[PDB]
Symmetry: C5
Subunit: 103 residues, 5 copies
Amino acid sequence: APQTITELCSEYRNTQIYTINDKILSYTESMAGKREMVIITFKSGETFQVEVPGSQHIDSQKKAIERMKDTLRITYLTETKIDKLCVWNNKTPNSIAAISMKN
Amino acid sequence: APQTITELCSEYRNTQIYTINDKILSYTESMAGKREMVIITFKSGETFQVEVPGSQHIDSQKKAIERMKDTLRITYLTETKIDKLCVWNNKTPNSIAAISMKN
Amino acid sequence: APQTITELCSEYRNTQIYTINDKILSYTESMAGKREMVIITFKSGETFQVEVPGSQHIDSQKKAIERMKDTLRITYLTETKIDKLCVWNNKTPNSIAAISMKN
Amino acid sequence: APQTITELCSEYRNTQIYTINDKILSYTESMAGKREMVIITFKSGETFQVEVPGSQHIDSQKKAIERMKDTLRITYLTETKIDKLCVWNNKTPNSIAAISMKN
Amino acid sequence: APQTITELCSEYRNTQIYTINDKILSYTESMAGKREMVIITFKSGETFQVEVPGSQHIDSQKKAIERMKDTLRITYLTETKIDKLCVWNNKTPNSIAAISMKN
Ligand SMILES: O=c1[nH]n(CCc2ccccc2)c(=O)c2cc(O[C@H]3O[C@H](CO)[C@H](O)[C@H](O)[C@H]3O)ccc12
Ligand SMILES: O=c1[nH]n(CCc2ccccc2)c(=O)c2cc(O[C@H]3O[C@H](CO)[C@H](O)[C@H](O)[C@H]3O)ccc12
Ligand SMILES: OC[C@H]1O[C@H](O)[C@H](O)[C@@H](O)[C@H]1O
Ligand SMILES: OC[C@H]1O[C@H](O)[C@H](O)[C@@H](O)[C@H]1O
Ligand SMILES: OC[C@H]1O[C@H](O)[C@H](O)[C@@H](O)[C@H]1O
C-alpha cells in the first residue's frame, strides 16, 4: 500500500496534490436532493468538494465518502491545519480523493 | 457542481438564502413519534428545522438528513458561527436545505 | 411543524415540560440485556431515561432513539446547559421525548 | 425501569458494582479477528473489558455494545471521571454491563 | 480474554508491538477506489496503515476497522499520546491490529 498521500495520489489519473498548510476557511453542507455534498474553501481562494455519491463510485467508496465528510466537518470545527489534498481535477470544483493533516 | 451555498440554493424552487452571521442560540431535538426532527433558533428569534424524513425526500437524502442533524448539534455545542442558510420557504419553520459556516 | 419544544410536547398525551436550566449531573449507560438504556440526573434530583427500544416505538423512531442517547452523552461531557425536557410521565423514570439546549 | 446503576445492576445474576471514582488509566482497542474488543484499566490496578460480541448477547445488545465502546473512548480522551461500573464477575477480565459518570 | 495489548498481540502470527509514546504526527485518509484506507505517521518516521477492508477480514472485523479509523482521527485531533501499536508486519506500511493509550 502507499505510504504517503502523494504516492497514493499518483496511482490515479486526473489527480493532483494541493499543499494547503492551513485551516479550512468555510464549510458548506447540503442535504438538498441530488446535491447531497460538502464544499470547503480556503483563504487562498481554492475550493473543493466531496462529490455526491454517483455511478462512478464502487460500494467500498460509499462508506469512505461519508467518512471524508465527517472528517472535513470536525477538521473545520476544530480549526485543524490541513497538510495536503489529493483531488480529481476533472470536476468543478475539484473533488477530494484524500486528505492529510499535520501541525 | 455548485461551489457555494448560493450557487447550490439557486438550483431549487421554493428556496432562499438567509445570511445569519451568528451562532445557534438554541437547539431542540425530538424523538417523539412522527416528530423526529431538530429545530434551531438564533438570537433574532428566527427558527428553522431539519424536516422529519418523508415522501418528499429521495433515498440519497436519508443519510444527508441525519448528517445535517449531527452537524447542527455539534455546531451548537461548539458555539460555531453560521454564515448562511439555504432554506425551503414553503414550510414552517423554514426548512434547512444547506448551511455554510465561516471563520 | 411545531416551532418550539413546548408546542411539540403539547401534541402528545402523557407528556409534560420540565424546565431544567442546568447541566446534567450524572450520566448512566447500560448495555445489559433488555436494559439497553440511558439514565440522566440533575442536581434537582430529577431523573430521566431514554427507554429501551420497544413495541411502543415506530420504525422512524429507531434512529431517533440512538441520536437522543448520543446527544445526552455529549451534552453531559461538555457540561452543556439543558433548557427544557419534554417527557412522557407515564413511565418511571420519566421518559425523554425531546430536549432543548440554550445557555 | 431501574433509576440508578446500582438498581439496574441488581436485576442480574453474576454482576456487581465497582466504585471507580477515577478517570481511566489506559485504553486498548483491538480489531484483531475474534478479539474485536476494548480493555480499560485504572490506577487501582483494576482491568475491565467490553466483550467481543458473541452468542451470549441478544440482538438488542448489538448497538449497545458498540455504544459502550464509543463511550469508553471519549471518556478516556476527555479524562472524565467514572463513578461506578456494573460488571459481570464471571469473565476475566470483568465484563462491563453499565457505566455511570458524575459531576 | 487478554488483559493488555502485548498479550493480545502475541495471540497472532506476523504481529509485533511498536511502542510509540507520542502523538500522531500526521493523519491521512483516502476515499480513492480500492484505497479506502488511513495512514498515520510519527516524528520517529514510523508509518502505519488501517488496511482497506478485504477478503482476509471477517464480518466482525469490518465494524472494528471503521472504529479504528474513527479512533485514529480523534486521537490525532486531540494530540493524544499513543502508547503502543500491535501491527501486522506482513504488509507495507505495517497494518494496525490494536492501539493502547495511557495517562
Ligand atoms: O486464519 C486466520 N485466523 N486469525 C485468528 C483469528 C481469526 C481471523 C479470521 C478468521 C478466523 C479467525 C488471524 O488472526 C488471521 C490473520 C491473518 O492475517 C491477515 O488478516 C489480517 C487482518 O485480520 C491482516 O490483514 C494480516 O496482514 C493478514 O495476513 C490471516 C489469517 C488469520
Ligand atoms: O476504472 C477506474 N479505476 N480506478 C482505479 C480504482 C478503481 C476504482 C473503481 C473501480 C475499480 C477500480 C479509479 O480510481 C477510477 C477513477 C475514475 O474516476 C472517476 O471517479 C472518481 C471517484 O472515484 C472521481 O469522481 C473522478 O472525477 C471520476 O473521473 C474512473 C475510473 C476509475
Ligand atoms: O427534499 C426536501 C424538500 O422536498 C420538497 O422539495 C419540499 O417542497 C421542500 O419543502 C423540502 O421538503
Ligand atoms: O414513543 C414512545 C412513547 O410511546 C407511547 O406513547 C408511551 O405511552 C410513552 O411512554 C413512550 O414510550
Ligand atoms: O449479555 C452479556 C452476558 O451474557 C451472559 O449473561 C454472561 O454470563 C455474562 O458474562 C455476559 O457475557
